[PDB]
């Protein structure tokens, strides 16, 4: 989302903690989207659901 | 109920640069609902229990 | 592109895209005749009645 009433879009929540160096792996029910896979590499995804 | 759950895919040359683009574009198709628009040729039928 | 599964013995040589259609190893059973329960409906009338 676009925060701080300007032209900066930061990533809220968990994925921002992945981007900011607070962690190095995410092992959780995190879906695969087009917007997260812009710059975050995934793996073969555990399961199949909808 | 399937025993060893996997997927299909698209095989490719080893570590070529063209992987990461198609990796986006397929997800864009999943992002648009066009697989269910591609359902009209794909797996529908008669008497699925 | 086509029907081509994903496993470990092929992923060493070839790179793969995102999984594309959910699949796996299943089993098709015969088209057997219909069967009723192997007993008469003696379930729990015996508890109270």
Radius of gyration of chain B: 15 Å
Question: What oligomeric state do these chains adopt?
Answer: part of a larger assembly
**Largest sheet properties of chain A:** 2 strands, antiparallel
Q: How many helices of chain A?
A: 1
PDB class: signaling protein/immune system
Keywords: Channel, antibody, SIGNALING PROTEIN-IMMUNE SYSTEM complex
Entry title: Cryo-EM structure of GluN1b-2B NMDAR complexed to Fab2 non-active1-like
Chain A: Glutamate receptor ionotropic, NMDA 1
Secondary structure blueprint with pairings:
This is part of a larger assembly, with one copy of chain A (50 residues) and two copies of chain B (49 residues).
Chain A: E1 2-3, E2 8-9, H1 13-19
Antiparallel strand pairs in A: 1-2
Chain B: E1 6-7, E2 11-12, H1 19-32, H2 34-37
Organism (chain B): Rattus norvegicus (Rat)
Protein name (chain B): Glutamate receptor ionotropic, NMDA 2B
Family (chain B): Belongs to the glutamate-gated ion channel (TC 1.A.10.1) family. NR2B/GRIN2B subfamily.
């Amino acid at each position: 989302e676009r925060v701080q009433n300007s032209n900066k879009k930061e990533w809220n929540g968990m994925m921002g903690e992945l981007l900011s160096g607070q962690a190095d792996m995410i092992v959780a029910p995190l879906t695969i989207n087009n917007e997260r896979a812009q710059y975050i590499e995934f793996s073969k995804p555990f399961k199949y659901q909808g | 109920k399937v025993f060893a759950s996997t997927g299909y895919g698209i095989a490719i040359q080893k570590d070529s640069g063209w992987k990461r683009q198609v990796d986006l574009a397929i997800l864009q198709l999943f992002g648009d609902g066009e697989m269910e628009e591609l359902e009209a040729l794909w797996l529908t039928g008669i008497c699925h229990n | 592109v086509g029907s081509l599964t994903i496993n470990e013995e092929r992923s060493e040589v070839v790179d793969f895209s995102v999984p594309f259609i959910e699949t796996g190893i299943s089993v098709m059973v015969s088209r057997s005749n219909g069967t009723v329960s192997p007993s008469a409906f003696l379930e729990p009338f015996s508890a109270c009645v």
